[PDB]
Subunit: 133 residues, 3 copies
């Protein structure tokens, strides 16, 4: 068909870096641009096209069942493969991500009406606190 | 007027990078900051101001008519001028971007509820697929 | 509790830089990621979880009273110390930030119902226009 009207949300993006290299894009811009997805709005009249590309910093999705191991590729992080397992420890949700990196995983728990999140890798621990919106 | 109250959506931003360079902001940060737009919410009571600046990625717009060449400045890319032509090859939308870089352009086509996009420049090809939203 | 259901708005984020370095994330990416906040949406039915982390740019706040000097450590910028003063010059709001950089400040004014903002540092000017939304 020749009908390009619609709102189009990117689902895959292959060799974006090489293309950018051909245009003489600097390292920093390339290293950010590779972490984006795009939604593109095409408004087409006959042979008149108006198009708008929208850019966004690419979400981190992850689905799991507690105690069910699952493969995880950490796109938009460090692009690694890990074998993740989430367990209950009391009321703490604990995830170990087995792979190249040592001590890798995270912890989630509720205290009060705040969500606590510990991100761990190696000897580094990142602490995050969330309030319900 | 002395009333700045409102929600203010950026319309243009010139020499943002030169201003940032004068402040000694590192190259990486500036290359990001130039791809943002800003909405500034101003709450002004008398001489008391509270302001909040919001950041978003710019966007990339482009209008054309099939078979009507048009000069194109590729902002937020490699910032070049090209004489672009979007033409039909069957039901594939074909774009040639004449300029310093050559074999530069793209091919777009619909199959099912997917839009396919090949970006080519030099010997590099980038493949992107979009789902209709 | 074991009920993680909700939409969770980040309130604090400690040692995010160290964690990312432990993951070998490139310098450019780390300088961006430190300017983001996250909203984590958790959909949990028993031990089944779906989670989506969304990224958004940290807002940049500044409150002031015209004619009252105040010290400023420039946060999302170049982290220098400045003595800031906002004064009226007719209906042009004028701000001087005294410090190492010379001619550092900005000018903001409404003409029509667009907002004009001139940012200055040294001999460099950045001109920005906003429309009221
Ligand atoms: C149909 C033609 C399309 C979708 C495009 C041609 C070039 C595009 C583009 C838009 C934005 C970006 N980046 C944001 C920073 C780099 C790269 C390429 S879309
Ligand atoms: C339940 C949510 C969890 C465990 C999260 C784990 C890692 C997250 C994340 C998302 C993005 C980034 N950045 C991009 C570079 C840094 C780091 C960590 S959420």
């Amino acid at each position: 068909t020749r009908d390009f009207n619609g709102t189009w949300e990117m689902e895959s993006n292959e060799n974006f870096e090489g293309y950018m290299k051909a245009l003489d894009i600097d390292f920093a811009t390339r290293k950010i641009a590779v972490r984006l997805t795009f939604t593109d709005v095409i408004d087409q009249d006959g042979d008149n096209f108006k198009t708008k590309a929208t850019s966004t910093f690419l979400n981190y999705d992850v689905d799991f069942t507690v105690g069910v191991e699952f493969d995880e590729y950490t796109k938009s992080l460090d692009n690694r493969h890990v074998k993740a397992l989430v367990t209950w420890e009391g009321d703490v949700l604990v995830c170990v991500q087995k792979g190249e990196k040592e001590n890798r995983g995270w912890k989630k728990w509720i205290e009060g009406d705040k969500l606590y999140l510990e991100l761990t890798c190696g000897d580094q621990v990142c602490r995050q606190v969330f309030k319900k919106k």
